[PDB]
Write a protein that binds this ligand. Structure first.
Ligand SMILES: Nc1ncnc2c1ncn2[C@@H]1O[C@H](COP(=O)(O)OP(=O)(O)OP(=O)(O)O)[C@@H](O)[C@H]1O
Ligand SMILES: Nc1ncnc2c1ncn2[C@@H]1O[C@H](COP(=O)(O)OP(=O)(O)OP(=O)(O)O)[C@@H](O)[C@H]1O
Ligand SMILES: [Mg+2]
Length: 521
């Protein structure tokens, strides 16, 4: 009955850790008056915002998230924003509470969010079982280290309804089994046609703005005595009953820009208040680019001997390393212009800092490792007689080590690096290829390591002893598809992506892992 104004600004956030938020001015016919509509924290559950274009769906979302942010710090509240419209939730990306920001085409990013949520819900259910509780409200009441509330904010659900099936199933899980774990879901939507019942029924609070066709309103909420006028912000908010309400604006302002300017100021203020509070981490993602300098410093946390860091795990964004103690040898398998020489550089850079006794470097055709020559540990090999000298010199040391081993108790690395296997078998005979193969099965435990790079066909072409010995090596770095090499039997599909310089596969023990290889320069 009482006339509702067209524009109202929300009250100032003046209650730390509030349990109720004024989101709009509602008509209360039972009193024939007006008062704030208070959304109950946790209890009122997930929020579904509906209405036609231009009637305040995204505006309501902004008022909610900014209100919650004023009461809780980024350690208590985490935002995951899915902006599947026209960047309506883009400003909120600067909120300290915003853990990550997702877009409609962020396919890799979204799939990793799903992985995180599945694990996070698992961990939370396991933390509850220890405290013998079933609610985060109970857990955070009996715990020293409290769990942060997670909110999945999704704008424009219309694109999920059709274009993204696998992602919708997860959203249904979040809405159905999320409240108890501390995970809540707020979403806007225009067309309510294909919103499944297990999602709609888990949207306890429904904020329904004006619809051009009254049919959609009847689908969301039941029959009502009152209807909403075509006024932006005007809505029927149903939880138990529908209350005619004018939703509050995100901030003060006589027009849109003035409001948006004040919103930006408020977010700067929250940034000042919560400055001493740690902000949530984003979903573990691989960097756009990766240099050896960056990889060595900010990623390699542990620099232990006998371990060779070769790249970043795609899934965990953590460095995978070669265990020289359990896998003394390694193959660099790849294709034309894929990253073979660069991987060799990574191994060499990982060496030279572990105090090797000697490093025999047999460069390839292009001479792309001539810069590593003349170093105080590297024996750059060009000629055939020079190679024979290094092998026989390595033979002497490894033989004495065998005599030092028999004498005393149960080694600094003696390393033989081959940038090109094709070039090796082009400047040597099948007899010397047997000598190298012999040293591998005789001195492997005495600190002798080999690293041979080359294209996939180079490892399967030969019938010689060296080829036979190399195809028994279980550890490898693949700068090629798993479906384009005959050395290792690895699971794959036709839909596996193509490899490009900067990526590859870390292979050991019959298992593999997509890795990001740093660029050495
Ligand atoms: N609670 C409100 N009070 C006053 N005006 C509002 C309110 N909500 C929205 N408006 C007005 O409506 C305009 C657009 O609203 P909004 O973009 O939030 O609707 P929408 O449904 O999210 O739009 P679309 O979905 O078509 O992108 C704003 O410029 C604003 O002036
Ligand atoms: N890890 C990497 N990240 C980014 N770019 C790379 C990486 N590795 C190689 N490249 C680029 O690939 C190009 C070819 O170098 P690369 O050593 O990878 O080829 P290759 O494996 O030696 O091929 P071939 O042995 O057939 O000559 C170089 O210009 C280099 O810039
Ligand atoms: Mg090369």
């Amino acid at each position: 009955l009482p006339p509702l104004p067209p524009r109202l600004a929300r009250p100032a956030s003046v209650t730390a850790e509030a349990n109720a938020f004024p989101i709009g001015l509602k008509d209360e016919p039972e009193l024939q008056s007006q008062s704030d509509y208070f959304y109950q924290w946790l209890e009122d559950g997930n929020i579904g915002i509906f209405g036609s274009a231009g009637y305040g769906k995204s505006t309501t979302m902004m008022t909610l998230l900014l209100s919650f942010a004023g009461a809780y710090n980024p350690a208590q509240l985490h935002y995951y924003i899915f902006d599947f419209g026209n960047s309506a939730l883009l400003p909120l990306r600067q909120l300290p509470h915003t853990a990550d920001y997702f877009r409609l085409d962020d396919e890799k990013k979204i799939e990793k969010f799903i992985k995180f949520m599945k694990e996070e819900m698992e961990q939370r259910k396991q933390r509850f079982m220890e405290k013998e509780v079933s609610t985060i409200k109970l857990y955070n009441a009996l715990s020293e280290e409290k769990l942060p509330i997670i909110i999945v904010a999704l704008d424009n659900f219309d694109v999920v309804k059709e274009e993204m099936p696998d992602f919708e199933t997860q959203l249904i899980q979040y809405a159905r089994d999320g409240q108890s774990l501390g995970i809540f879901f707020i979403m806007t939507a225009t067309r309510v046609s294909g919103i499944r019942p297990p999602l709609m029924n888990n949207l306890k609070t429904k904020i329904v703005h004006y619809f051009i066709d009254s049919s959609e309103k009847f689908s969301l909420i039941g029959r009502t005595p009152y209807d909403v006028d075509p006024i932006p912000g005007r809505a029927l908010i149903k939880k138990d009953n529908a209350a005619l309400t004018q939703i509050y604006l995100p901030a003060d302002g006589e027009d849109d820009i003035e409001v948006l300017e004040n919103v930006k100021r408020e977010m700067e203020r929250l940034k000042e208040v919560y400055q001493h509070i740690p902000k949530p981490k984003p979903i573990p993602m691989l960097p756009p680019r990766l240099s050896m300098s960056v990889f060595t410093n900010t990623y390699v946390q542990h620099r232990a001997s006998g371990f060779i860091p070769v790249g970043l795990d795609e899934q965990t964004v953590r460095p995978v390393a070669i265990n020289m103690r359990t896998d003394p040898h390694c193959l660099i398998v790849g294709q034309s212009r894929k990253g073979k020489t660069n991987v060799v550089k990574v191994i060499l850079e990982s060496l030279l800092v572990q105090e090797p006794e000697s490093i025999g470097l047999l460069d390839g055709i292009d001479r792309g490792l001539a810069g590593y020559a003349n170093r105080d540990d590297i024996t750059y090999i060009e000629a055939k007689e020079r190679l024979a000298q290094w092998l026989n010199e390595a033979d002497a040391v490894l033989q004495q080590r065998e005599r030092e081993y028999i004498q005393a108790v149960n080694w600094p690395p003696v390393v033989f690096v081959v940038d090109s296997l094709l070039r090796l078998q082009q400047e040597t005979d099948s007899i010397m290829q047997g000598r190298i193969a012999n040293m591998m099965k005789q001195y492997s435990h005495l600190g002798f390591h080999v690293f041979v790079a080359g294209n996939a066909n180079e490892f399967v072409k030969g019938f010689d002893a060296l080829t036979a010995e190399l195809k028994q090596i279980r550890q490898a770095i693949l700068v090629t598809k798993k479906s384009e090499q005959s050395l290792f039997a690895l699971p794959f599909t036709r839909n596996e992506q193509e490899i490009e310089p900067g990526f590859g596969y870390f292979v050991v023990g019959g298992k593999d892992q997509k890795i990001q290889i740093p660029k050495v320069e």
